[PDB]
Structures are given as structure tokens and as C-alpha cells.
Amino acid sequence: ACNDRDCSLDCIMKGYNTGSCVRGSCQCRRTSG
Numbered sequence: 256a257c258n259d260r261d262c263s264l265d266c267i268m269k270g271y272n273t274g275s276c277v278r279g280s281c282q283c284r285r286t287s288g
Contacts (some may be wrong), residue, residue, distance in 0.1 A: 257281050 256262075257276035266274030266283030274283035 257279050259275045262274045269273035271283035272286045
């Protein structure tokens, strides 16, 4: 499931802060800089 539910959760654990479904995938994004 690429839903932001499991995607975001995993994105925050991978080391980033959030993420979303992309073309049926899951990317993450950090909030800093």
C-alpha cells in the first residue's frame, strides 16, 4: 500500500520527516535547510 499512512510512517522512521505515494510508490521528504 503506497498510501501516505504506511508510506509516511516508514518515511519518518527511515530518517526523514514525511512522505507520500508516488506513481504507486513511496517517497520521503525532510523539513530542514
